[PDB]
Amino acid sequence: HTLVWGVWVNGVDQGDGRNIYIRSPPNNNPVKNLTSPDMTCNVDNRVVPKSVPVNAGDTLTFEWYHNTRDDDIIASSHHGPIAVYIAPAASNGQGNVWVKLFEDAYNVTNSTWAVDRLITAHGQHSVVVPHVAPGDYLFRAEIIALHEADSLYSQNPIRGAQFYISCAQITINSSDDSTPLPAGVPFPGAYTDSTPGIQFNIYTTPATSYVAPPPSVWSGALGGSIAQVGDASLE
Ligand SMILES: [Cl-]
Ligand SMILES: [Cl-]
Ligand SMILES: [Cl-]
Ligand SMILES: [Cl-]
Ligand SMILES: [Cl-]
Ligand SMILES: [Cl-]
Ligand SMILES: [Cl-]
Ligand SMILES: [Cu+2]
Protein backbone atom coordinates (compact mmCIF):
# COMPACT_ATOMS: atom_id res chain seq x y z
CA HIS A 1 0.00 0.00 0.00
CA THR A 2 1.93 3.04 -1.33
CA LEU A 3 1.42 6.26 -3.36
CA VAL A 4 3.56 8.91 -5.07
CA TRP A 5 3.97 12.16 -3.06
CA GLY A 6 5.80 14.10 -5.78
CA VAL A 7 8.91 14.19 -7.97
CA TRP A 8 12.37 15.77 -7.88
CA VAL A 9 14.15 17.16 -10.98
CA ASN A 10 17.99 17.13 -10.82
CA GLY A 11 17.73 16.81 -7.01
CA VAL A 12 15.27 19.74 -6.62
CA ASP A 13 11.93 18.82 -4.97
CA GLN A 14 8.96 19.90 -7.15
CA GLY A 15 6.77 19.84 -3.99
CA ASP A 16 3.55 17.97 -3.17
CA GLY A 17 2.13 16.73 -6.50
CA ARG A 18 -0.92 14.85 -5.23
CA ASN A 19 -3.93 15.75 -7.40
CA ILE A 20 -1.76 18.54 -8.88
CA TYR A 21 0.75 16.92 -11.28
CA ILE A 22 0.16 13.28 -10.16
CA ARG A 23 -3.10 11.63 -11.27
CA SER A 24 -3.58 10.47 -7.66
CA PRO A 25 -6.06 7.73 -6.80
CA PRO A 26 -8.28 8.25 -3.74
CA ASN A 27 -6.19 5.88 -1.57
CA ASN A 28 -3.18 3.51 -1.51
CA ASN A 29 -5.09 0.26 -2.37
CA PRO A 30 -3.63 -1.87 -5.18
CA VAL A 31 -5.03 -2.62 -8.60
CA LYS A 32 -5.19 -6.44 -9.07
CA ASN A 33 -7.51 -7.13 -12.06
CA LEU A 34 -5.19 -7.43 -15.07
CA THR A 35 -7.99 -6.56 -17.55
CA SER A 36 -9.19 -3.50 -15.55
CA PRO A 37 -9.23 -0.02 -17.14
CA ASP A 38 -7.60 0.88 -13.74
CA MET A 39 -4.32 -0.79 -14.98
CA THR A 40 -3.63 2.33 -17.16
CA CYS A 41 -3.13 4.98 -14.45
CA ASN A 42 -4.99 3.59 -11.41
CA VAL A 43 -8.63 4.22 -10.50
CA ASP A 44 -8.84 8.03 -11.10
CA ASN A 45 -7.17 8.67 -14.46
CA ARG A 46 -7.96 12.27 -15.49
CA VAL A 47 -6.00 15.40 -16.49
CA VAL A 48 -4.69 17.21 -13.36
CA PRO A 49 -3.85 20.91 -13.48
CA LYS A 50 0.02 20.88 -13.62
CA SER A 51 2.72 19.15 -15.73
CA VAL A 52 6.30 19.26 -14.37
CA PRO A 53 8.84 20.83 -16.76
CA VAL A 54 11.98 18.80 -17.51
CA ASN A 55 14.61 18.60 -20.22
CA ALA A 56 16.02 15.46 -21.89
CA GLY A 57 18.90 14.13 -19.73
CA ASP A 58 17.45 15.45 -16.44
CA THR A 59 17.29 13.05 -13.47
CA LEU A 60 13.55 12.57 -12.65
CA THR A 61 12.99 11.07 -9.21
CA PHE A 62 9.63 9.61 -8.05
CA GLU A 63 9.06 9.74 -4.29
CA TRP A 64 6.64 7.16 -2.72
CA TYR A 65 5.08 7.08 0.75
CA HIS A 66 2.59 4.88 2.72
CA ASN A 67 0.52 7.16 5.00
CA THR A 68 2.67 10.30 5.47
CA ARG A 69 5.73 11.66 3.61
CA ASP A 70 9.06 9.85 4.23
CA ASP A 71 7.45 7.16 6.50
CA ASP A 72 7.91 3.37 6.16
CA ILE A 73 7.17 3.86 2.35
CA ILE A 74 5.60 0.39 1.81
CA ALA A 75 5.20 -2.65 4.03
CA SER A 76 8.42 -4.75 4.00
CA SER A 77 6.30 -7.89 3.10
CA HIS A 78 5.60 -6.33 -0.36
CA HIS A 79 8.73 -7.69 -2.10
CA GLY A 80 8.76 -7.23 -5.88
CA PRO A 81 9.98 -5.30 -8.91
CA ILE A 82 9.74 -1.64 -10.00
CA ALA A 83 9.19 -0.40 -13.59
CA VAL A 84 8.71 3.00 -15.23
CA TYR A 85 6.87 3.48 -18.54
CA ILE A 86 6.33 6.58 -20.71
CA ALA A 87 3.49 7.44 -23.13
CA PRO A 88 2.52 10.67 -24.98
CA ALA A 89 -0.05 12.53 -22.85
CA ALA A 90 -2.52 13.01 -25.75
CA SER A 91 -3.10 9.20 -25.67
CA ASN A 92 -4.46 9.43 -22.10
CA GLY A 93 -2.60 6.11 -21.80
CA GLN A 94 -4.90 4.36 -24.29
CA GLY A 95 -3.81 2.00 -27.03
CA ASN A 96 -0.35 0.64 -27.86
CA VAL A 97 1.60 3.50 -26.22
CA TRP A 98 3.55 2.48 -23.08
CA VAL A 99 7.33 2.24 -23.56
CA LYS A 100 9.45 0.84 -20.69
CA LEU A 101 12.26 3.13 -19.46
CA PHE A 102 13.32 1.17 -16.32
CA GLU A 103 13.16 -2.27 -14.72
CA ASP A 104 14.64 -3.52 -11.44
CA ALA A 105 13.49 -6.85 -9.97
CA TYR A 106 15.80 -8.98 -7.73
CA ASN A 107 19.45 -7.96 -7.61
CA VAL A 108 21.61 -11.12 -7.40
CA THR A 109 24.77 -9.10 -6.52
CA ASN A 110 23.21 -7.71 -3.28
CA SER A 111 20.40 -10.25 -2.60
CA THR A 112 17.52 -7.67 -2.46
CA TRP A 113 14.27 -6.89 -4.27
CA ALA A 114 13.74 -3.45 -5.81
CA VAL A 115 11.01 -2.71 -3.21
CA ASP A 116 13.45 -3.50 -0.37
CA ARG A 117 15.95 -0.95 -1.84
CA LEU A 118 13.10 1.57 -2.37
CA ILE A 119 12.41 1.57 1.39
CA THR A 120 16.16 2.12 2.13
CA ALA A 121 16.08 4.99 -0.46
CA HIS A 122 13.24 6.76 1.44
CA GLY A 123 10.79 5.97 -1.36
CA GLN A 124 12.98 7.46 -4.15
CA HIS A 125 13.78 5.95 -7.57
CA SER A 126 14.91 7.82 -10.71
CA VAL A 127 15.05 7.70 -14.50
CA VAL A 128 17.01 9.81 -16.97
CA VAL A 129 14.54 11.74 -19.16
CA PRO A 130 14.89 10.27 -22.72
CA HIS A 131 15.66 12.22 -25.92
CA VAL A 132 12.05 12.05 -27.25
CA ALA A 133 10.06 14.80 -28.99
CA PRO A 134 9.32 17.89 -26.86
CA GLY A 135 5.79 17.86 -25.44
CA ASP A 136 3.51 16.46 -22.75
CA TYR A 137 4.02 12.91 -21.43
CA LEU A 138 2.73 10.52 -18.79
CA PHE A 139 5.38 8.68 -16.72
CA ARG A 140 3.75 5.56 -15.28
CA ALA A 141 5.66 4.27 -12.23
CA GLU A 142 4.64 0.70 -11.24
CA ILE A 143 5.50 -1.34 -8.14
CA ILE A 144 4.40 -5.01 -8.23
CA ALA A 145 4.10 -6.52 -4.72
CA LEU A 146 4.43 -10.31 -5.03
CA HIS A 147 3.74 -11.49 -1.43
CA GLU A 148 0.32 -12.98 -2.48
CA ALA A 149 1.21 -13.66 -6.17
CA ASP A 150 1.40 -17.46 -6.02
CA SER A 151 -2.35 -17.24 -6.79
CA LEU A 152 -3.81 -15.56 -9.85
CA TYR A 153 -6.32 -12.85 -8.88
CA SER A 154 -8.59 -14.38 -11.61
CA GLN A 155 -8.65 -17.67 -9.59
CA ASN A 156 -8.75 -16.17 -6.03
CA PRO A 157 -9.65 -12.48 -5.88
CA ILE A 158 -8.47 -12.18 -2.26
CA ARG A 159 -4.91 -12.78 -3.59
CA GLY A 160 -2.76 -12.03 -6.65
CA ALA A 161 0.03 -9.73 -7.68
CA GLN A 162 -0.64 -6.18 -6.40
CA PHE A 163 -0.03 -3.22 -8.76
CA TYR A 164 0.76 0.22 -7.26
CA ILE A 165 0.47 2.46 -10.35
CA SER A 166 1.09 6.23 -10.42
CA CYS A 167 1.01 8.48 -13.50
CA ALA A 168 2.91 11.78 -13.36
CA GLN A 169 2.32 14.59 -15.88
CA ILE A 170 5.75 15.60 -17.25
CA THR A 171 6.45 18.18 -19.99
CA ILE A 172 9.74 17.67 -21.91
CA ASN A 173 11.00 21.08 -23.12
CA SER A 174 14.62 20.84 -24.42
CA SER A 175 15.37 17.61 -26.36
CA ASP A 176 17.34 16.85 -29.53
CA ASP A 177 14.76 14.08 -30.36
CA SER A 178 17.68 11.71 -31.10
CA THR A 179 15.50 8.74 -29.91
CA PRO A 180 11.94 9.20 -31.20
CA LEU A 181 9.44 7.36 -28.99
CA PRO A 182 8.03 4.28 -30.76
CA ALA A 183 4.71 2.56 -30.22
CA GLY A 184 4.54 0.53 -27.05
CA VAL A 185 2.25 -1.83 -25.17
CA PRO A 186 -1.28 -1.35 -23.83
CA PHE A 187 -2.37 -1.24 -20.19
CA PRO A 188 -4.60 -3.05 -19.59
CA GLY A 189 -3.45 -5.87 -21.92
CA ALA A 190 0.36 -6.19 -21.70
CA TYR A 191 0.06 -8.36 -18.52
CA THR A 192 -2.03 -11.52 -18.62
CA ASP A 193 -2.43 -14.61 -16.41
CA SER A 194 0.29 -16.38 -18.53
CA THR A 195 2.80 -13.48 -18.54
CA PRO A 196 6.12 -14.34 -16.81
CA GLY A 197 6.47 -12.59 -13.47
CA ILE A 198 2.74 -12.20 -12.66
CA GLN A 199 2.20 -15.55 -10.85
CA PHE A 200 5.24 -16.17 -8.63
CA ASN A 201 5.67 -17.87 -5.25
CA ILE A 202 8.28 -15.88 -3.25
CA TYR A 203 8.07 -18.42 -0.39
CA THR A 204 9.11 -21.51 -2.55
CA THR A 205 10.55 -20.20 -5.88
CA PRO A 206 14.04 -18.67 -5.59
CA ALA A 207 14.09 -14.94 -6.40
CA THR A 208 17.24 -15.64 -8.47
CA SER A 209 14.82 -17.31 -10.98
CA TYR A 210 12.34 -14.38 -11.12
CA VAL A 211 11.83 -12.78 -14.53
CA ALA A 212 9.88 -9.50 -14.52
CA PRO A 213 6.96 -9.12 -16.92
CA PRO A 214 7.81 -7.96 -20.44
CA PRO A 215 8.08 -5.71 -22.32
CA SER A 216 11.87 -5.32 -22.27
CA VAL A 217 13.41 -1.93 -21.54
CA TRP A 218 13.45 0.26 -24.71
CA SER A 219 16.76 0.64 -26.58
CA GLY A 220 16.26 4.46 -26.23
CA ALA A 221 16.19 4.37 -22.43
CA LEU A 222 19.09 6.13 -20.69
CA GLY A 223 18.96 4.35 -17.29
CA GLY A 224 17.95 5.01 -13.71
CA SER A 225 18.60 4.13 -10.09
CA ILE A 226 16.89 3.27 -6.78
CA ALA A 227 18.64 5.74 -4.46
CA GLN A 228 17.78 8.73 -2.26
CA VAL A 229 18.39 11.95 -4.32
CA GLY A 230 17.07 14.41 -1.72
CA ASP A 231 16.34 14.71 1.99
CA ALA A 232 12.63 15.41 2.53
CA SER A 233 13.45 16.11 6.23
CA LEU A 234 15.72 19.13 5.30
CA GLU A 235 12.46 21.03 4.45
CL1 LIG B 1 16.09 14.21 -9.31
CL1 LIG C 1 1.53 22.96 -16.13
CL1 LIG D 1 6.78 -3.15 7.29
CL1 LIG E 1 1.81 15.90 -19.28
CL1 LIG F 1 18.87 16.84 -25.76
CL1 LIG G 1 6.74 2.40 -33.62
CL1 LIG H 1 14.92 -5.37 -20.39
CU1 LIG I 1 -0.13 -3.14 0.57
Curated annotation (Swiss-Prot):
Reactions catalysed, as given in the entry: [(1->4)-beta-D-glucosyl]n+m + reduced acceptor + O2 = 4-dehydro-beta-D-glucosyl-[(1->4)-beta-D-glucosyl]n-1 + [(1->4)-beta-D-glucosyl]m + acceptor + H2O
Encoding gene per record: LPMO9A
Family: Belongs to the polysaccharide monooxygenase AA9 family.
Residues where Methylhistidine is found: H1
EC nos: 1.14.99.56
GO terms under biological process: cellulose catabolic process
Protein's UniProt keywords contain Secreted: yes
Activation/inhibition comment: The polyphenol cinnamtannin B1 contained in methanolic extract of Cinnamomum cassia (cinnamon) acts as an inhibitor of catalytic activity.
Protein name: AA9 family lytic polysaccharide monooxygenase A
Cofactors required: Cu(2+)
Top-level lineage group: Eukaryota
Disulphide linkage map: C41-C167
Lineage: Eukaryota, Fungi, Dikarya, Basidiomycota, Agaricomycotina
Pfam family, one: AA9
Binding sites annotated in the UniProt record for O2: H147, Q162
Application of this enzyme or protein: Lignocellulose is the most abundant polymeric composite on Earth and is a recalcitrant but promising renewable substrate for industrial biotechnology applications. Together with cellobiose dehydrogenases (CDHs) an enzymatic system capable of oxidative cellulose cleavage is formed, which increases the efficiency of cellulases and put LPMOs at focus of biofuel research.
Compartments in which it is found: Secreted
